[PDB]
Amino acid sequence: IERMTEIALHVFRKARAGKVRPAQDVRGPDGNVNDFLEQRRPFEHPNPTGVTH
């Protein structure tokens, strides 16, 4: 049951990370390195609570 659990937990971690970043191609759930490049807030949803600069 120890071996079965770590197999399911490894799938769970990849599936959990896939919810915020879905799977587009063969790379799988959360398999895109470009997602973690520098990103900015959209123009229609700026920072509502504080200053940006």
Partner 1 sequence: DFAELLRPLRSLSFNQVVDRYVLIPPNHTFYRNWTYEKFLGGFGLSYLILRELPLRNFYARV
Long-range contacts of 5-8 (CB under 8 A, 24+ apart): none
Total residues interacting with partner 1, rule: CB under 8 A: 4
49 binds partner 1 (CB under 8 A): no
Enumerate residues 11-40 that contact partner 1 by CB under 8 A.
none
- Nearest approach, Cβ of 42 to partner 1 (angstroms)? 11
- Nearest approach, Cβ of 44 to partner 1 (angstroms)? 9
Residue (22 or 46) nearer to partner 1, CB = 46
Long-range contacts of 36-42 (CB under 8 A, 24+ apart): none
Instruction: Let me know: does 30 contact 15? Beta carbons within 8 Å.
Output: no
